[PDB]
Amino acid sequence: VYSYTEKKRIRKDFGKRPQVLDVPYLLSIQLDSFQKFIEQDPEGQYGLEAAFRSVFPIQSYSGNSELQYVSYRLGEPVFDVQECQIRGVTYSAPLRVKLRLVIYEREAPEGTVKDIKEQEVYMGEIPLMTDNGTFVINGTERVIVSQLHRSPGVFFDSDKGKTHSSGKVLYNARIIPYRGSWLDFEFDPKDNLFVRIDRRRKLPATIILRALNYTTEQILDLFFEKVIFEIRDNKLQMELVPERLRGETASFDIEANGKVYVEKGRRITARHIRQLEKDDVKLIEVPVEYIAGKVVAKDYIDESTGELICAANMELSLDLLAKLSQSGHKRIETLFTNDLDHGPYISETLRVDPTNDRLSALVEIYRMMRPGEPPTREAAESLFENLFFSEDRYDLSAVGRMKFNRSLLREEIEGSGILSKDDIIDVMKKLIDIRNGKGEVDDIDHLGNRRIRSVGEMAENQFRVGLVRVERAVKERLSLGDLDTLMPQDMINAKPISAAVKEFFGSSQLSQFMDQNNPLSEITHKRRISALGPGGLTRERAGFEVRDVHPTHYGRVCPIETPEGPNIGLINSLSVYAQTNEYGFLETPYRKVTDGVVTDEIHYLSAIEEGNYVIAQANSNLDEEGHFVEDLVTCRSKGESSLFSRDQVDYMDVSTQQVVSVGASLIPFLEHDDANRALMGANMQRQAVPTLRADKPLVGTGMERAVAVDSGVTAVAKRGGVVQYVDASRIVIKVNEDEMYPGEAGIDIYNLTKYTRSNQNTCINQMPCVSLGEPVERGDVLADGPSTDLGELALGQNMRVAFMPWNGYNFEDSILVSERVVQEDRFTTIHIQELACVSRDTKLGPEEITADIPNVGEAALSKLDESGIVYIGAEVTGGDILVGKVTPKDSSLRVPNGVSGTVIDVQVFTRDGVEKDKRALEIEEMQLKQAKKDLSEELQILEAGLFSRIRAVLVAGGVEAEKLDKLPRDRWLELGLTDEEKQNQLEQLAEQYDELKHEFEKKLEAKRRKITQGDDLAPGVLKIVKVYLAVKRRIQPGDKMAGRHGNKGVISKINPIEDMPYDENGTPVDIVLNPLGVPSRMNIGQILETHLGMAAKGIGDKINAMLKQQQEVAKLREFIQRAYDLGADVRQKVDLSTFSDEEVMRLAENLRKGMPIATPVFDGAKEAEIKELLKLGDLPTSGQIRLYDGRTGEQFERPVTVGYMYMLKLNHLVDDKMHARSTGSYSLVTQQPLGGKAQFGGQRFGEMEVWALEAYGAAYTLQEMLTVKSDDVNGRTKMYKNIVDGNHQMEPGMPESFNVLLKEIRSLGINIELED
Amino acid sequence: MIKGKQGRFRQNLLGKRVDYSGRSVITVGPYLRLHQCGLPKKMALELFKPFIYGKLELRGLATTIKAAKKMVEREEAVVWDILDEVIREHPVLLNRAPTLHRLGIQAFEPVLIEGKAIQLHPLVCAAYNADFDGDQMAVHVPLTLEAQLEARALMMSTNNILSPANGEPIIVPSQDVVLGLYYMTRDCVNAKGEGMVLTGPKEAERLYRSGLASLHARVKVRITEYEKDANGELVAKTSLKDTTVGRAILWMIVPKGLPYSIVNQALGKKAISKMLNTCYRILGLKPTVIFADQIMYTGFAYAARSGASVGIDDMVIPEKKHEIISEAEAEVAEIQEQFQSGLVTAGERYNKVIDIWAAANDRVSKAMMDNLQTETVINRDGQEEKQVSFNSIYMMADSGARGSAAQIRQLAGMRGLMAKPDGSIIETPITANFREGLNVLQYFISTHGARKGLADTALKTANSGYLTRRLVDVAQDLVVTEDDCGTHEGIMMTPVIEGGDVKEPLRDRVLGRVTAEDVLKPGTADILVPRNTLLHEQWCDLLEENSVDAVKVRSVVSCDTDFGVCAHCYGRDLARGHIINKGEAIGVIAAQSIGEPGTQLTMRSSIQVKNKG
RNA sequence: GCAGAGGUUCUAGCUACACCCUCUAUAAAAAACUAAGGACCACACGAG
DNA sequence: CTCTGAATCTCTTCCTCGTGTGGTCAGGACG
DNA sequence: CGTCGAAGAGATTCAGAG
Ligand SMILES: NCc1c[nH]c2nc(N)[nH]c(=O)c12
Ligand SMILES: [Mg+2]
């Protein structure tokens, strides 16, 4: 089946792999993420409620005064998006919070509260997100890009190579919390564990262990296996376990019960250890020379004098052992030191330890944390427990707990957010294991270790920051003020929470300005994820392995699209199918595979779960029965593709375009061109200005009907029905019966946005796409947006392109353009530009807005009305006067030079208190009349629809229609309707209509007041006027023009039509490209797109020939069916026998310009199908035809390539580039040019240009670049008079910058002068 | 506010921004001669405002400056006529943005045009390293009379033909003109007009324009070959030489002094550069500017008539590729089975796989090349004959117009083995070209190299800039102040060989310098060349005959002049083929010429004899 | 402004480097003379 | 035992032109 | 109404043996 609009222009589709999952709503990463930030969560997790919970306990210290949060809600926004864009006020919503305050009795924590105080307080002004996912801040659409930062948890780096410059590896561990202080354990070349917090100076590791109430015996037992020695009268018999002996060389011969197993001086073999274990011997004799070298494990004391014989963690001393031997401690303990496996990295660190007690360790910690501060017995205790084990000063997120417990091989998922004593020692043991050989380091760049942070989480964090500040205020207030003396509103201020949220939304490194160059630029900008910003890495700190694309980017992020320049590979865009996990990580869909059959149910796989599995490839031929058709299937197991068997695989890619991003997926034949060129082909689409008459792409990927709809440019109908009244500014649809609600359904109205300035000064326009009586289905486009045709993305205009050198006018990247292009107006774009004049209130009197301009002629005032405002519709040019402003003794706003446009509208803002002038009154009255007419037109049409609905019930119940006509149509209540199930519904409808009348009689007055009230303004301005200019920029030699495949170049000449080459039939080509750019830069896709375009236009020409002369419908139908079949099997298989033979005549009209062709990126049309399509019409199979020279008229040998190529016009137009200046304003340092910009400026004679001058013998020109031109107050004013006089002389003077440097050094206490 | 890139010393004292400036995008500008460049009227009007005021005052049109300003803003007919006066002989400096070396900022004579883009002679789009993908040049103006004369006697584009880094020319024809000349100078074994006799080039151009004879046809023509063998005299000899019609048409463009053994070969790119160099060497400068300006016109005009287009059928996939792929798969499978049997180690098997894949890649590349160049076959009025191909992709590679065999290897044959981000070679190479489809995995692998290469730009340029700055500020003060140190010792010079072919002969390094001690003929006690004579080409040719390997040469390391090197100790200026003038700033020239190639520079048994001897 | 004063105009116009004219108590007959206050930081973009 | 070298800590610099948007003290009474 | 990361040189640290 096919929808009605789908039947209008159905696109021939290539591709053999049948997709299973439709592409999701592209913007669903931002909308859903913000939906979890303001929507109510009874769960109160990751929600405005989860932010309140923590900051709302409110307890005055011993003040028995408590305040608790109960409920919150968002008030209705004061202004809509449209009504706030003009005023510039943020699209916000008040935040109403209900707070409960109760008062306990004195010294009664358990006593009942004597009274309850409940009220609703207004705090903060939280912004809101438009339907497309754009925040309005100050009248400018702003979007917030998601961030990608290292996830909270624990990571074990390696720091291989450069450290210690001796080939050693220094293993280190970090504990990064979500909100707190970094804790880092780091090894040393001397093999000593060192603890370092917040990147401070080092510290022996045991110091942070001693602070945890841990004894030396406990510390030793927590890191080592103790070897037990027992005193015997048999040469100090010791218990020897074979496992520990394994890995140890035979220091002495090993015997038990008078039998030797391992010989002295011989390395012990695994077989020897196995036979020792078989013998199951426990005790093995040992010389006293082996025990003396063993470090003791536990402290041993004598029972006579009470003192300790040997201290624990002390190397054994034979004299100490002899004292222990005479004392006779039945058990002797030593730790099992083994340099091969059980490296003693704790004992040496404990030797380095300078303290012996917990208090000393705390004192050392305080000294290191706060240098220069005298210690205190309580300050250090408080500081240490606050740094880590405090709920407020340290909080690992739930994601942090999950990651930290997974890296430590735990089993639970949820746990306490604060660090625990056992967790630190577990991290220490893991680090020691890493050092010993077990385990492995974790890769930082692994996409399982970098969560994604959308707008909602950042907004919640900012709200929490504001909340803790206001909490610090309210708690302090609650202690001083007497209890139950005032309402709970006084203790709280809305602004501290506000200046924290509005500051983030307005000025941030992530709340970026939104570019609206295309429906695709918006889509690819709300999706872009960047690694910069707060909590992330900067450009200077960005290494080179981070920018590289990891093997785990397959399907989670785009490996092609990244902005070139400084931040390359740091702002990679999200893929098309990737969807964020619940914890923040990235997920990519896959299809579950049973033993032999690939099912239909799909699975979303995380970044880490993808590893242990084996995943097949999208290019795996399937029998449609679920079984693979070959015996060996390529897969991707451990980030390394290889060949496997059919039975091994258990996952396949969902589709074939899931690796690429949105924009990069629009390039047809993407797989044919190098990635280096696709990187710019995907970056030269987001800069294509929307042209005048948008034209569909003759050869598009197939993702054009999913970028226009999913963005906001188009206007999709949310209800199905028929079109009642269309117009160039509004579309009224009458809904069906089933799709409408039983009551108050009525009809739906869409308002189209006419020409409005965009953020890049391009026009934003909506054009109707339907006609009266045409049925419209649910979720169907009926309003083509800017750069969008028939609900199908269309950025450029397909042009007939021929590849050949043409007299050097397309030298190496230039593009020759025929006059036929300009004549057809195929590239003349609109450029709406906005101007503003401000009337400040200076001293000596405010400036006037009047039209009486002194010292001006009568010509300039012709384009000015009485009030001093330009007429709406005049054609102004460069230097003309727009609005008259005379400064109190000529400051009237003037059009900037070069701009030549027509004023489309003028809006005047007036501050309350000052009087509105005549033109302001005219504008206000016009807007009021338009608002009243809108509120009346909506009622008139809604009444038509509602009364049409009413007649359906009026005929049900045996009521004659004529009598209803006799009584007034507005009120049918006079008749007694027959009682039924619909009579009550109709009475409810009428009562709601009457209530609606009373509601409208109030909303009209509300609108009256809203328009009339003087708007707010910045302090010190009376009235500000905005004037809009609408230039129509044409195409010009110098304007950039780029294809889709990565080919760019400026136009070099607008050749006359006759000079262009022409094929045999007489049609002249429109663009002459340079072929010499194809072999060097392997973008061979474009040569393979031109042939497809030529085939499409050839079929279009055949259809047009069939249509131009009268032809039977069957002829057209059979030809189009043939075209849609086209040989090799395709997924589409669209049939024409079901069309009613009248929609065929409309499809032919929509195809006569050329049948569109789809081409999914990585399963596109093979060249055989292109050849068959070429042979379907008439054009030669090879794709080249014999052109003819225009000037000479002779023939071109070696026939050249012709066809149709999609060509965008990049917005780097030449009219915004020329700047040249001679004289003008200067700076404070008198370096005259002041910087080339909108303000006059001279191009910088930079540092290297001085060297380039010195390389020649030119010095006089260097002197004139450095002294007279740039900065010489007595040089400029002298040579400006010398030149007009007639003599070109010079006087050097001496630059003012040197007189500035002399002062900047003389004011430094250094006397620098000049001799003579 | 003193130190750093923001301080005065590097922001406001060295690099002062200047008045009388401008900016615009680039355009091909083919028609203007190489001594002139385009300029929009709406820019030249604003640049030359004081000159216009002065000329209006001289004409008496404007009584005061106010009226002159008013009439200038009027943009009436009189103002344009005045502007066409102050623009007549007033050079302007077309300065590229990142001027790495001396030729970055050159002078040009303006030619007023409409539009809004700055035109540029194509032959100088190489020294600038200026593309046309929307690049932006800045226009400066010299004001004083001395500046106007300097931008004429030193900076005009016709004055710096040879780069200061090396004697080789810098205005070598680059992309379209070279392809046109290559397509002009060729031969098809059977085209209409074969074996005919032609009176001369004046008649060959007519016989080709009429269409009676194809551009390529082996014929017999007579040519007046002028010779300068007599000192200062032109000897005219005329012999019936055998060549093509296309080569004969090309003869009239070349000046008379040059012989005929240059326009007879296939005329790739290096041949054209050598032709320009010989013209400069034996004819001077004035008859070389005209020649290099005329060659571009001919090249463009005969590359437009060629219709050299690229089509899909051009990029042939060799038939042997499928068999090579299958056999390589069999060999790797054999090694895999051996590893699974424990016979070989993992590393040894990996090395064997890499080596066999490299061998297979070279084999398939050779097969594609042999099926690309030779495979053309046509008739010679009889049986079939072999002939070098006319494939457009091949003609864009043999001529050196754009691209080398390595890129074509990526268009028809297999891409090869790609490198992992960590510097390792992936076990399985990409067995698919670009004309064929590229798989998903074979593209995700390919993106690694593209990302690394694009990220290395933002560090190669950042490091080359610092190296160039240090090298500039370390010399910064060398000026040739004295004409003769009079010293005796100079560093030795010998050819450098690594064991293969000689990397640099003694005829290359020594040329342009001055000897220290009297170089002696191999016959002893014979002084071939005196001790203090400069060595030009007529001397290096003599040195080749005697075959001497060690020649002492004075160098600026052994000069004894304080605060400046000598003129003799520095040798040839390498920009003009004469001894360096007393004063030229050579301190910065070397620093720029060393730090300039820092952009394209990459940041990272039994010995068998070569020949009998 | 010869010194003081006023000045056509072509913003303002004995200094900004300034300049000229007529006139004798105060403005009014005339042409030739000039070019002004604009800092820092984030984000995005292009090219080498 | 006193330099001998040998770690160890501290300061420096890391391209060059443009095209554009947006945001921003200092320090609120005070007599 | 003023008025109150890398990476490299160099200078500290610091050391080991005859
Ligand atoms: N502004 C009055 C006036 C008219 N003419 C003038 N000429 C000169 N040199 N200076 C002036 O001030 C005037
Ligand atoms: Mg370029």
PDB file of C-alpha atoms (C1' of nucleotides) and ligand atoms in Angstrom, chain B residues 96 131-135, chain C residues 47-48, ligand 2:
ATOM      1  CA  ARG B  96      48.732  35.355   0.120  1.00  0.00           C
ATOM      2  CA  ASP B 131      44.145  26.895  -5.070  1.00  0.00           C
ATOM      3  CA  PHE B 132      40.806  28.154  -6.328  1.00  0.00           C
ATOM      4  CA  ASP B 133      38.554  26.463  -3.722  1.00  0.00           C
ATOM      5  CA  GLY B 134      37.617  29.881  -2.325  1.00  0.00           C
ATOM      6  CA  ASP B 135      41.082  31.038  -1.203  1.00  0.00           C
TER       7      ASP B 135
ATOM      8  C1'   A C  47      41.719  28.109   3.700  1.00  0.00           C
ATOM      9  C1'   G C  48      46.837  27.063   3.460  1.00  0.00           C
TER      10        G C  48
HETATM   11 MG    MG F   2      42.212  26.345  -1.335  1.00  0.00          MG
END
